Design a protein around this ligand. Sequence first.
Ligand code: HEM
Length: 152
Amino acid sequence: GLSDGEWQQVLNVWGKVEADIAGHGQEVLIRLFTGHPETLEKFDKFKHLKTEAEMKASEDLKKHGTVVLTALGGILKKKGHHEAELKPLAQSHATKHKIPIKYLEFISDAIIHVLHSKHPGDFGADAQGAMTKALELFRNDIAAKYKELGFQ
Ligand code: HEM
């Protein structure tokens, strides 16, 4: 549950991501895969990437980064009213992709990391607080659908 002020910050920060959605998406996935290599194993089309150089050079990884952040942005722009947007993602990630909620925690923190890296001194304390809350909300609503499905 975010305030309007907080949502305003979130969508303000998001404007940064939208100026370069592929570059941000790329760096988030790279930060995830290198921070937590077990996550790479969930992708049959990235599992071949051994090195970070190969990750950086991967146009298909950048492509998927675009897909992921496009979906997250659509959800964020709903300001919490994202049940229709979120339900199919929860279902596919639980039932088809089999992604534990721990990995959503991982990518949440990775987004925070990337924003500081790409915008040092331009991602203030209030901004981080708002973005973190928004990602927690997202995660918590997925977690509810996971529980429903009995998925661990
Ligand atoms: C912000 C969090 C995330 C968002 C918004 C997101 C969004 C999406 C979308 C829109 C797709 C394609 C449609 C679909 O299959 O439902 C997808 C596919 C996929 N996602 Fe996620 N995802 C997120 C996090 C993760 C994480 C943390 C993992 C694994 C560690 C993951 C694993 C996958 C895999 C394996 C696919 C299918 C890839 C393929 O073979 O095309 N996702 N995701």
